[PDB]
């Protein structure tokens, strides 16, 4: 939790903007594409510390869904959240693929 005066500093606002995306979108790279029509997207987030005034990074691995199964391992993609639960692990939907690794 952040105090009222902690929500107006440039350090916190800058971190917020980086994390914040349209439709709560995220950026990550796929690390597992073994199961059919399934890909695990590894997203990286950021956080601010009001004590030492330094920002660190922590990975957030999540599961996604692909229709055409165009994405492959080691390919940065875009994910979008959803207001339901489908499958045991599936919690995201693909939109597009930015980069493609050769084979």
């Amino acid at each position: 939790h952040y105090k009222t005066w902690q929500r107006n500093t440039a350090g916190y606002l800058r971190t917020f903007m980086r994390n914040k995306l349209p439709n709560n979108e995220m950026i990550g790279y796929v690390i597992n594409d073994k199961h059919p029509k399934s890909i695990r997207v590894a997203c990286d987030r950021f956080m601010y510390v009001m004590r030492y005034k330094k920002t660190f990074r922590y990975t957030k691995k999540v599961w996604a869904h692909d229709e055409e199964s165009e994405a492959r391992l080691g390919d940065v993609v875009r994910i979008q959240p959803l207001g339901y639960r489908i499958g045991p692990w599936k919690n995201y939907v693909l939109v597009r693929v930015l980069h493609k690794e050769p084979r």
Binding site: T9, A10, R14
Partner: protein, 125 residues
């Protein structure tokens, strides 16, 4: 960014006339702002290194204190309304790195845009 912090050691000398400095794209832009204020007599890019002259007056140099705020391991940012509180009742020179190039602290408040404090020149506490 690392090469930027290496300029304070060379420019902060008393018994010297000219000192070398590693060549960098960002370093060239910084020297332009300092020369306008009358802090550096001149500089010249000698290829892999830049030769910068030193200014003196009545023995003592024009530069007496250098403070590095920004570091490669982190990033200091201040809002337009917060920079005024920090910088008040002083004659110091703060290098601000805004989106539209590099400007001093005096110009940053005029535009009202959020800059980035890089270094301090002729600054006290």
């Amino acid at each position: 960014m690392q090469r930027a912090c290496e300029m304070v050691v060379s420019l902060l000398r008393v018994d010297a006339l000219s000192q070398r400095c590693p060549f960098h794209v960002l370093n060239v832009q910084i020297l332009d702002l300092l020369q306008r204020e009358g802090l550096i007599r001149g500089f010249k890019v000698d290829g892999t290194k830049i030769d910068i002259l030193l200014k003196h007056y009545k023995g003592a140099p024009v530069i007496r204190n250098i403070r590095v705020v920004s570091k490669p391991s982190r990033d200091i940012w201040l809002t337009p309304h917060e920079l005024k509180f920090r910088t008040r009742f002083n004659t110091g020179l703060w290098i601000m790195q805004t989106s539209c190039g590099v400007i001093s602290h005096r110009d940053c408040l005029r535009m009202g845009i959020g800059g980035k404090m890089l270094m301090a020149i002729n600054n006290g506490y």
